[PDB]
């Protein structure tokens, strides 16, 4: 049960989905092997780009195309403690 995921810089990957798996868990490895972390990105369902969260249950998205974008490079609030 595969989902098509478009990535930044014209890249693209297919990921496998099991029931209950979150989007984060479904995409973690496919992003890691391309040098990307979900925490640095936003994800969308193509339907237009509709934003969805990283805790979306990916089983409901089988059959759709998703898109991953980098978050804009703006400073984060300090969290060192
Ligand atoms: C990726 C990363 C990039 C940008 C982030 O947020 C930008 C924003 N204002 O929302 C982000 O949030 C977690 C992550 C990578 C970084 O480039 C980076 C900078 C600072 C802190 C953490 C990170 N990054 C992570 C989480 O790997």
Swiss-Prot record:
Tissue specificity comment: In skeletal muscle, isoform 1 is more abundant than isoform 2.
Subcellular location: Cytoplasm; Cell membrane; Mitochondrion; Nucleus
Subunit structure: Monomer. Homodimer. Heterodimerizes with BRAF and this heterodimer possesses a highly increased kinase activity compared to the respective homodimers or monomers. Heterodimerization is mitogen-regulated and enhanced by 14-3-3 proteins. MAPK1/ERK2 activation can induce a negative feedback that promotes the dissociation of the heterodimer. Forms a multiprotein complex with Ras (M-Ras/MRAS), SHOC2 and protein phosphatase 1 (PPP1CA, PPP1CB and PPP1CC). Interacts with LZTR1. Interacts with Ras proteins; the interaction is antagonized by RIN1. Weakly interacts with RIT1.
Protein modification: This modification leads to destabilization of the protein, possibly through proteasomal degradation.
Its biological purpose: Serine/threonine-protein kinase that acts as a regulatory link between the membrane-associated Ras GTPases and the MAPK/ERK cascade, and this critical regulatory link functions as a switch determining cell fate decisions including proliferation, differentiation, apoptosis, survival and oncogenic transformation. RAF1 activation initiates a mitogen-activated protein kinase (MAPK) cascade that comprises a sequential phosphorylation of the dual-specific MAPK kinases (MAP2K1/MEK1 and MAP2K2/MEK2) and the extracellular signal-regulated kinases (MAPK3/ERK1 and MAPK1/ERK2).
Disease (UniProt): Noonan syndrome 5: A form of Noonan syndrome, a disease characterized by short stature, facial dysmorphic features such as hypertelorism, a downward eyeslant and low-set posteriorly rotated ears, and a high incidence of congenital heart defects and hypertrophic cardiomyopathy. Other features can include a short neck with webbing or redundancy of skin, deafness, motor delay, variable intellectual deficits, multiple skeletal defects, cryptorchidism, and bleeding diathesis. LEOPARD syndrome 2: A disorder characterized by lentigines, electrocardiographic conduction abnormalities, ocular hypertelorism, pulmonic stenosis, abnormalities of genitalia, retardation of growth, and sensorineural deafness.
Entry similarity comment: Belongs to the protein kinase superfamily. TKL Ser/Thr protein kinase family. RAF subfamily.
Protein name: RAF proto-oncogene serine/threonine-protein kinase
Highest taxon listed in the record's lineage: Eukaryota
Organismal lineage: Eukaryota, Metazoa, Chordata, Craniata, Vertebrata
Protein residues bound to Zn(2+) 1: 79
Domain RBD: 1-71
